[PDB]
Amino acid sequence: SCPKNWKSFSSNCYFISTESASWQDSEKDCARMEAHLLVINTQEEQDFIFQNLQEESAYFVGLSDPEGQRHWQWVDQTPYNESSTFWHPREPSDPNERCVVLNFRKSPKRWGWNDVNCLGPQRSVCEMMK
């Protein structure tokens, strides 16, 4: 049911970016395709998308702290559940890193979340509801 070049999971469709852009330009691009940036709700959704990423690249996610107050918000305005997050050790790390990416670290090997700069172009993941 999903369009061309979109992975399928549950009742949604997910696009794994190859081009890089800023966080807002990435959300605008997901909106052009009638979607939003990735909003991770269940661990089954999280492990599915880790499986489909370049381990050597970071991927933008619809979680941001626009004020720097460490008040993380999903773009679909669903509640942020602190205890069920996938942060790497020591992250979040910088109040000026206000945008969340998925990235694979090498020692020890782990998939997780990391806060990075928002203007610095990265890859992205769009979530489209079907």
**In the set 23, 49, 115, 125, which binds Ca ion (CB under 5 A)?**
115
Q: Is the dihedral of CA 77, 26, 120, 108 positive or negative?
A: positive
Question: Does 56 carry a binding-site annotation?
Answer: no
Question: Locate tokens 């998939």: which residue?
Answer: 111
Q: Is 97 in the site for Ca ion (CB under 5 A)?
A: yes
Residue 84: HSE in the Cβ half-sphere, 13 Å Cα cutoff: 11
Question: Does 41 carry a binding-site annotation?
Answer: yes
- The binding track of 55-74 with respect to Ca ion, each residue x by CB under 5 A or -, is --------------------
By Cβ distance, which residue is nearest to Ca ion? 93
Cβ-based burial of 51 (10 A; exposed 0-12, middle 13-18, buried ≥19): exposed
Stretch that binds Ca ion, among 28-36, 49-57, 73-81, 93-101 (CB under 5 A): 93-101
Q: Is 96 in the site for Ca ion (CB under 5 A)?
A: no
Whether 101 contacts 113, CB under 8 Å: yes
Q: Where are the alpha helices (DSSP H) in the chain?
A: 23-32, 43-50
Binding-site residues for N-acetyl-D-glucosamine sit at 103-105
Footprint of Ca ion (CB under 5 A): 39, 41, 91, 93, 97, 114-115
